[PDB]
Amino acid sequence: MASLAPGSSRVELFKRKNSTVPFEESNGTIRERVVHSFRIPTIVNVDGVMVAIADARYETSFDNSFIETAVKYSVDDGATWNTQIAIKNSRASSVSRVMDATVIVKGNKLYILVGSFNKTRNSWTQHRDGSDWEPLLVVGEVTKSAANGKTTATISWGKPVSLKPLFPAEFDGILTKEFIGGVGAAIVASNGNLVYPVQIADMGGRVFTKIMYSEDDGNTWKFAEGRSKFGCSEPAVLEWEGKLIINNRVDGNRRLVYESSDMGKTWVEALGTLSHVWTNSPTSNQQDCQSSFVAVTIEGKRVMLFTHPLNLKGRWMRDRLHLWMTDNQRIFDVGQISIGDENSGYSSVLYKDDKLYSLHEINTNDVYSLVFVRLIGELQLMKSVVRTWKEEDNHLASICTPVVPATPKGGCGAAVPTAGLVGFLSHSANGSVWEDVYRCVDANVANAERVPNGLKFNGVGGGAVWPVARQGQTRRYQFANYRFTLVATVTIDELPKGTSPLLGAGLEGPGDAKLLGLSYDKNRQWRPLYGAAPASPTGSWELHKKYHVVLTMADRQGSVYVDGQPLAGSGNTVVRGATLPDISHFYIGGPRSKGAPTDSRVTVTNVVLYNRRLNSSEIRTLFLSQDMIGTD
Numbered sequence: 001m002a003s004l005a006p007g008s009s010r011v012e013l014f015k016r017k018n019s020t021v022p023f024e025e026s027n028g029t030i031r032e033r034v035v036h037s038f039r040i041p042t043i044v045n046v047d048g049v050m051v052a053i054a055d056a057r058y059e060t061s062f063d064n065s066f067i068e069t070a071v072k073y074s075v076d077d078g079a080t081w082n083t084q085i086a087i088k089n090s091r092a093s094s095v096s097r098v099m100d101a102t103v104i105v106k107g108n109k110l111y112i113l114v115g116s117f118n119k120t121r122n123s124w125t126q127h128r129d130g131s132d133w134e135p136l137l138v139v140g141e142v143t144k145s146a147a148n149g150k151t152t153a154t155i156s157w158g159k160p161v162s163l164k165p166l167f168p169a170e171f172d173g174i175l176t177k178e179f180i181g182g183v184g185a186a187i188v189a190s191n192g193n194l195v196y197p198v199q200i201a202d203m204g205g206r207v208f209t210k211i212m213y214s215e216d217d218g219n220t221w222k223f224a225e226g227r228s229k230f231g232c233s234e235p236a237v238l239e240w241e242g243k244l245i246i247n248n249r250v251d252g253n254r255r256l257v258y259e260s261s262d263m264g265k266t267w268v269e270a271l272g273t274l275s276h277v278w279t280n281s282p283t284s285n286q287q288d289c290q291s292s293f294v295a296v297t298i299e300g301k302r303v304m305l306f307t308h309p310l311n312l313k314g315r316w317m318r319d320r321l322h323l324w325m326t327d328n329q330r331i332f333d334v335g336q337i338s339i340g341d342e343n344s345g346y347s348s349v350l351y352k353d354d355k356l357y358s359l360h361e362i363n364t365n366d367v368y369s370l371v372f373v374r375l376i377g378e379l380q381l382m383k384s385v386v387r388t389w390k391e392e393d394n395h396l397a398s399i400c401t402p403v404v405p406a407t408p409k410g411g412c413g414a415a416v417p418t419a420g421l422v423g424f425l426s427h428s429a430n431g432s433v434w435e436d437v438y439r440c441v442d443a444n445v446a447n448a449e450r451v452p453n454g455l456k457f458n459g460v461g462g463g464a465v466w467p468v469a470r471q472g473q474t475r476r477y478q479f480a481n482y483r484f485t486l487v488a489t490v491t492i493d494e495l496p497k498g499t500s501p502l503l504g505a506g507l508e509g510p511g512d513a514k515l516l517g518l519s520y521d522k523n524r525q526w527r528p529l530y531g532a533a534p535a536s537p538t539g540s541w542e543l544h545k546k547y548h549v550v551l552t553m554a555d556r557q558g559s560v561y562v563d564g565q566p567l568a569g570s571g572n573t574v575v576r577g578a579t580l581p582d583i584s585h586f587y588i589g590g591p592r593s594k595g596a597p598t599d600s601r602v603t604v605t606n607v608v609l610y611n612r613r614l615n616s617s618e619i620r621t622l623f624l625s626q627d628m629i630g631t632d
């Protein structure tokens with residue numbers, strides 16, 4: 001189906017039952033040994049040298065088997081590679097193993113944290129105690145040099161050091177058992193700290209994540225105070241605008257994402273941005289998978305990249321590996337980078353010298369290879385999208401809005417708000433799709449006719465659905481359940497028989513409940529909808545006149561503004577309970593595929609969506625600049 005893009009290609013770099021590694025016998029003799037499966041990929045850039053790290057599972061692909069950490073490195077961007085076994089296992093039994101490498105690059109050093117086991121045949125979280133385990137830190141040093149035009153490099157690996165003595169016996173009364181790195185690429189924070197996200201198993205077997213960091217290049221390590229809820233594993237971390245963003249694997253439920261502004265001391269779920277957006281399968285009740293999560297700069301803009309399989313086949317098949325790019329506001333699906341319906345798995349992404357690559361698993365009959373992918377077609381699309389984002393943000397921020405009684409300048413009022421601006425439906429549209437100017441989430445349309453910057457509705461179900469929970473598996477507007485601002489310019493074209501819908505956020509579930517919204521009636525009054533509260537008519541409007549509508553929701557309170565002023569009933573609680581609402585979609589006009597044959601004769605233009613509640617000054621600015629923001 002969707003797949004590795006034209007222009008892109010790949011090679012089977014770590015070839016199952018084919019590629020050999022320099023296995024070192026007890027006597028020190030080296031033997032090129034065949035490897036059943038290569039798993040747990042990570043590819044990073046160390047001073048210009050590509051370094052690929054992986055589990056070499058010599059005899060079988062099972063987790064509790066004979067495994068050592070293999071490395072392939074290249075000084076020519078993948079033209080050629082050298083192979084080493086960077087970390088040996090204990091050689092204690094037929095199942096001794098060092099596994100699940102988590103890597104940090106600082107300068108010309110590579111810090112690799114692995115889980116080392118001697119003889120257990122069951123899963124690490126299920127062990128009776130931590131006795132078969134050791135968390136091992138290994139430092140590698142990359143040295144390159146050129147003699148007569150040819151550049152080559154070597155990598156020396158230090159002796160492993162166990163961090164077991166630094167592991168607290170308890171965290172808040174929680175008795176600890178074992179811990180392993182989050183798997184994949186970790187980071188050096190802006191303050192120089194080595195930051196490893198770790199997964200901790202407690203005695204009873206619960207798992208949760210934490211930040212383990214070093215302020216002195218690995219001489220000492222500290223476990224920060226904060227942690228994820230239980231149930232989180234294989235965390236990936238990146239630094240964004242002064243905060244650590246921790247993206248967790250969650251078997252059997254949606255992926256939790258946290259932010260910490262204080263080196264992991266305090267964690268706050270990112271309910272307004274990325275938490276619960278991604279998941280393990282269409283139904284979310286399947287085994288989840290490791291994901292890479294890296295911050296990069298493309299076309300002058302800082303963005304985050306995230307990889308994860310759709311896993312339509314379920315369990316560990318992990319078919320359809322996708323790559324997403326986000327600037328913490330918009331979330332773009334770059335596409336599927338694996339091929340057809342092949343099984344993929346754990347993955348890594350790297351942006352080096354303006355070229356994008358991936359190292360990821362492919363699985364056939366549970367025999368694993370690692371492919372090295374040149375994401376050429378994908379980078380081209382990413383750059384195009386980032387240019388769209390920059391261009392539209394700059395354009396909007398450059399509009400000279402009208403001065404207000406307390407302004408100061410090129411004689412312009414406040415800038416049109418662009419911070420937290422997530423989607424925008426304006427001019428571009430056809431008969432079936434109203435395009436998101438930011439190219440992420442389009443709205444579906446019915447019985448509509450184009451007008452400058454929007455659509456005029458006429459017909460049963462005429463209107464548009466901007467999907468929220470209806471996006472399905474990946475819920476990019478999941479933030480709306482926590483807070484949002486929806487804006488639009490509207491005209492009522494023909495009087496309704498009784499009451500008819502105009503704009504709002506619908507809720508999943510029976511009946512036809514709304515979280516917040518606005519309708520209009522035959523008496524030419526507005527009918528704001530505040531959660532489940534009885535709607536009472538208020539105010540006055542006239543046919544054919546343009547009105548500005550703003551819906552705000554934050555802290556469970558909802559307000560509805562018409563022409564910059566709140567309608568009666570605004571400002572009260574719209575969601576009772578502690579459980580987050582579950583918005584199905586935002587409706588524009590009166591869309592529907594069933595139930596009452598709604599036919600709202602209205603025209604709507606310039607629909608803007610923010611992931612926060614706009615303040616009074618921003619609402620006034622939008623009200624005053626309605627004629628200036630359209631893409632027409």
Ligand SMILES: *[C@]1(C(=O)O)O[C@@H]([C@H](O)[C@H](O)CO)[C@H](NC(C)=O)[C@@H](O)[C@H]1F
Nearest residue numbers: 040063099100115123124125233234289
């Ligand atoms: C991944 C995998 O699902 O494919 O699973 C890890 C854990 O088994 C899983 O998170 C449950 O605890 C394996 N790691 C270990 C140490 O078991 C990974 O190696 C990988 F197998």
